[PDB]
Ligand binder design. Structure first.
Ligand SMILES: Cn1c2c(c(=S)n(C)c1=O)N[C@H](SCCN1CCOCC1)N2
Length: 500
């Protein structure tokens, strides 16, 4: 019968109910704000700040395609003018769009294949849908792209390694930027930053790509038909000091665990985990289609993090507040399908951000299964998850539950039961409750619940549990001569505590 165990999800903290009173929104040395805060009003499109376009072309800011420094060989010409001339042409066939995009990407005319785009337009879409694409949706996308200098007036700093910095920008500004990424307009982006131009979406034979395309066009149709009115914050967070895990005296927090539901639907208002690549977004603009890529497609405002977010080091994460859901889907990887348009019902905070908080924390890839039991590797994951969960200067009463699942399992070779306990410990250290979705695995739900209530009823601390993990490594893994150990982790823990 039972679909969930533990503390009722109803009893877990959610935004906006649990939220702090936000301080007044204002630009500072660690907070770039690209709109007029004095004109920010519910239901109104934000006004860019500053009024006129200002340009920075350097190694600390986004290089905007509309910069006067974006040049091409003719003598130097303005590539932004070239871009306008190429994209301001009628499209009636997919070749026309390929040819347009290549005019200002000439070096790539033999490298970039547009097969997935051609197949999408010709062999996937209905003729009426193809007609709406080229008569309406693509021209509306060109227009919002070419409007970039009036929209995105303020230089956008890169979220570089080791920076603790926030960018708050309008959903409209994002739309402009992402329309540019679709048309592959971002200069010098074709090494420690993810891809942002969408050229790899158009390439290859793949049945994923039509579905990706449908998801993104669903977004593009919405935001070019009627401007979104809210804001989005992107915060790179980088911690210097990490807990001494073996000395940590904090108790475990509450747990709800279920084999039904999703982070995104059932974890509304909670800190939602993105099972990230260290290049945020992973394969979203290319071949990937699992948990991160899906989330970046149905909430495409996440994709713009790729424009400005340097690859995550071990002590870093990216926290994104206010992205909106535009699509629903079914399946994943080979069975992923775009279903329909989604009307996001989320409330907005006092900064006009959707009450949706997503954190990108990248797990390690374990080519050898036992490697993740090595203390250094356990600590690495604990500290990554901890950095992703901690909100310095906020009381625990005001922190939502963490909504997560089988982080780093799948292609990355994580043990689900180890990673569950890791996330439980990190959450406990950050003084947050845990809502854990096992994604159909009822046995995993029962196991995580059983271990959690076992440790809770015996009042073991974070440190107590971590020490038991070290004992597991020292007795069962270290001098282990086979691919897996003699005894599994949870049984080992039960026997070791029940032995005391
Ligand atoms: C929406 N969603 C969701 C997943 C999870 S685990 N949860 C909790 C969730 O809410 N996986 C996916 S697709 C990739 C499947 N692999 C399953 C094993 O783990 C790694 C990844 N989508």
């Amino acid at each position: 019968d039972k679909k969930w165990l533990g503390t009722p999800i109803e009893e877990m903290r959610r935004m906006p109910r649990c939220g702090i009173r936000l301080p007044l929104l204002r630009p500072s040395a660690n907070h770039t704000v690209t709109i007029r805060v004095d004109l920010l009003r519910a239901g109104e499109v934000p006004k860019p700040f500053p009024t006129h376009y200002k340009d920075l072309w350097d190694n600390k800011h986004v290089k905007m395609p509309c910069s006067e420094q974006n040049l091409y060989p003719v003598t130097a010409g303005s590539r932004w003018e070239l871009i306008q001339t190429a994209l301001l042409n009628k499209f009636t066939r997919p070749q026309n769009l390929k040819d347009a995009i290549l005019k200002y990407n000439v070096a790539y005319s033999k490298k970039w294949d547009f097969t997935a785009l051609i197949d999408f337009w010709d062999k996937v879409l209905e003729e009426a849908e193809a007609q709406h694409l080229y008569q309406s949706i693509l021209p509306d996308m060109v227009k919002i792209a070419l409007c970039l200098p009036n929209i995105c007036t303020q230089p956008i700093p890169l979220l570089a390694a080791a920076m603790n910095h926030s960018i708050t920008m309008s959903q409209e500004q994002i739309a402009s930027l992402l329309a540019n990424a679709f048309f592959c307009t971002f200069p010098r982006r074709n090494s420690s930053y993810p891809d942002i131009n969408f050229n790899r979406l158009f390439e290859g034979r793949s049945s994923r790509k039509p579905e990706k395309l449908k998801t993104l066009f669903c977004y593009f149709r919405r935001v070019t038909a009627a401007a979104p009115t809210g804001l989005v914050t992107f915060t790179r967070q980088s911690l210097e000091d990490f807990p001494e895990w073996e000395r940590c005296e904090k108790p475990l927090t509450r747990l709800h665990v279920t084999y039904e539901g999703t982070i995104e639907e059932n974890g509304q208002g909670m800190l939602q985990v993105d099972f990230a690549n260290r290049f945020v977004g992973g394969g979203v603009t290319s071949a990937g289609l699992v948990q991160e890529e899906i989330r970046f497609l149905i909430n495409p405002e996440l994709i713009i993090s790729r424009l400005f977010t340097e690859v995550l080091d071990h002590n870093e994460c990216l926290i994104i507040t206010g992205t909106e859901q535009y699509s629903e889907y079914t399946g994943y990887a080979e069975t992923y399908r775009w279903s329909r348009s989604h009307e996001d019902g989320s409330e907005r905070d006092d900064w006009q951000r959707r009450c949706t908080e997503i954190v990108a924390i990248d797990a390690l890839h374990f080519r050898r299964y036992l490697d993740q039991f090595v203390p250094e590797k356990m600590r690495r994951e604990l500290n990554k998850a901890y950095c992703g969960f901690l909100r310095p200067g906020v009381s625990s009463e005001n922190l939502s539950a963490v909504a997560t699942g089988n982080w780093g399992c799948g292609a990355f070779g994580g043990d689900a039961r180890l990673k569950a306990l890791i996330q439980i410990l990190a959450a406990a250290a950050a003084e947050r409750d845990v809502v854990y979705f096992t994604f159909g695995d009822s046995e995993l739900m029962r196991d995580i619940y059983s271990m959690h209530i076992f440790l809770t009823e015996r009042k073991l601390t974070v440190g107590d549990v971590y020490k038991l993990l070290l004992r597991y490594y020292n007795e069962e893994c270290r001098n282990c001569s086979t691919p897996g150990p003699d005894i599994k982790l949870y049984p080992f823990i039960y026997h070791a505590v029940e032995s005391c």
